[PDB]
Design a binder for this molecule. Structure first.
Ligand code: A1ABD
Length: 284
């Protein structure tokens, strides 16, 4: 079923809450035993959001290999993503270790450091060129190189140095700064513009490690970004683009990380972004 017809039918019937609960009911349930070990309690932002054991990213250290991050491998689309929580004061060094070890080119951040008057993640990158950050626990240095501030997003170039070997890499930080404190954006136009800026950078391409994507918990906004990207890629690739089923792509993604897409509005909005994306590409 052409998803815009499916969309109009769910909208006119006001059944978004019913479709969303059906997804919640069919979603995979896998063990998360490492996440729940007592030694890991201060590495988790939220008690009810944990990576599955089978898909968790392992840090390359014998001490404690745990970070709250998941590899989402989309086989038919040929895209991988790492979805993670916003870093905590005591996990900023682990975050940048993971970026280094997984060979990522890009970091995609979909939240503000403060929202609704509370801290949603640590200030994990330098705000001035001349004040670099040193992470003594993982032996890394991070420097701001340049900053490009636009109306809906900011792009930063960062230099990450492994102080152990003195190798350096350029990381691109893509920061979506305008997602509202409550609900979802009214139009998907600025979110699609942002997605195409990430794609244009090389950050999502197979010559690099997987892109790192986060919001506060790493499931809601983060889930929207990777679901919209994967659905548009499948429409480009397949002979029958009308066969792309957004609900089936979401269930496949939920085999790798729990709770992706947190509300019926986020589902409805994910449908909105994919529909608007399919016509910009038909070049109406
Ligand atoms: C036949 C109705 N459904 C679709 C039409 C065109 C495309 C596309 O060319 O991206 C995707 C779906």
């Amino acid at each position: 079923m052409e998803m815009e017809k499916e969309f109009e039918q769910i909208d006119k019937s006001g059944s978004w809450a019913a479709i969303y609960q059906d997804i919640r009911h069919e979603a995979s349930d896998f063990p998360s035993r490492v996440a729940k070990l007592p030694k890991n309690k201060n590495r988790n932002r939220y008690r009810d959001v944990s990576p599955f054991d089978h898909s968790r990213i392992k840090l390359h250290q014998e001490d404690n290999d745990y970070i709250n991050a998941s590899l989402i491998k989309m086989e038919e689309a040929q895209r991988s993503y790492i979805l993670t929580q916003g870093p905590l004061p005591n996990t900023v060094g682990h975050f940048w270790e993971m970026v280094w070890e997984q060979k990522s080119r890009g970091v995609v951040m979909l939240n503000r450091v403060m929202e609704k008057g509370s801290l949603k993640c640590a200030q994990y990158w330098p705000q001035k060129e001349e004040k670099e950050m040193i992470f003594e626990d993982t032996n890394l240095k991070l420097t701001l190189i340049s900053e490009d501030i636009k109306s809906y997003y900011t792009v930063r170039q960062l230099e990450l140095e492994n102080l152990t070997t003195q190798e350096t890499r350029e990381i691109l930080h893509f920061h979506y700064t305008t997602w509202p404190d409550f609900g979802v954006p009214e139009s998907p136009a600025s979110f699609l513009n942002f997605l195409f800026k990430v794609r244009e950078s090389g950050s999502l391409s197979p010559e690099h490690g997987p892109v790192v994507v986060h919001c506060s918990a790493g499931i809601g906004r983060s889930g929207t970004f990777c679901l919209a990207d994967t659905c548009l890629l499948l429409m480009d690739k397949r002979k029958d683009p009308s066969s792309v089923d957004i609900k089936k792509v979401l269930l496949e993604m939920r085999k790798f990380r729990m709770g992706l897409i947190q509300t019926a509005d986020q589902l409805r909005f994910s449908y909105l972004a994919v529909i608007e994306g399919a016509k910009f590409i038909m070049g109406d």
